[PDB]
C-alpha cells in the first residue's frame, strides 16, 4: 500500500503523468500556419496591452 502504490503515486508517477499530458498538449499542432499566426497576433496584442501600458 505504501511503497508500491502510494509513494510511487505521489512523487514519480504524478510527475510522469503531468509531464506526459503537457508534452501531448504542447506538441499537438496540425502544422497549419493560419492557426499559430493567429496565435502570434494574440501574443502581439497581449504584449502591447499588458506590458508597456505601465511605465
Amino acid at each position: 500500500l505504501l511503497d508500491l502504490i502510494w509513494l510511487e503515486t505521489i512523487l514519480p508517477k504524478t510527475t510522469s503523468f503531468i509531464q506526459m499530458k503537457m508534452s501531448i498538449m504542447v506538441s499537438n499542432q496540425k502544422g497549419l500556419i493560419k492557426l499559430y499566426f493567429l496565435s502570434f497576433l494574440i501574443t502581439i496584442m497581449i504584449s502591447m496591452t499588458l506590458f508597456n501600458y505601465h511605465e
Partner: protein, 98 residues
C-alpha cells in the same frame, strides 16, 4: 501627433493584422506584406520631410528596393507551391507538424 501620423500607423496595424489572419490564399498575404511596406515608406518619408533631415531622404528609396526583393522572393516561393499542388492555398502547407 497630427492625425496623419496616426492614420498611417493605423494603416500599418491593419495591414499587419490582415497578414496575420491568413484567410485562404497566399497572394493575399503577399499583398498585405506589400501594404505594410507602403505604410512604412509613407511614415518614414513624412517623418524625414517634417524634420528637414536632408541626408535621410535616400533612406526610403533603399527601403523600397528591399521591398521588391521580398516581393520577388515571395512570388518565387508561391510559384513552387503552385507547381506542387496546382493551387496557392495555405491549407496544403501541412506536411510538417510540431
Amino acid at each position: 501627433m497630427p492625425l496623419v501620423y496616426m492614420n498611417i500607423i493605423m494603416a500599418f496595424a491593419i495591414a499587419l493584422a490582415g497578414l496575420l489572419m491568413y484567410r485562404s490564399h497566399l497572394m493575399s498575404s503577399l499583398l498585405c506584406l506589400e501594404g505594410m511596406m507602403l505604410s512604412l515608406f509613407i511614415m518614414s518619408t513624412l517623418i524625414i520631410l517634417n524634420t528637414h533631415f536632408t541626408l535621410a531622404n535616400m533612406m526610403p528609396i533603399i527601403l523600397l528596393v528591399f521591398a521588391a526583393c521580398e516581393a520577388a522572393l515571395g512570388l518565387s516561393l508561391l510559384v513552387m507551391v503552385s507547381n506542387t499542388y496546382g493551387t496557392d492555398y495555405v491549407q496544403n502547407l501541412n506536411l510538417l507538424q510540431c
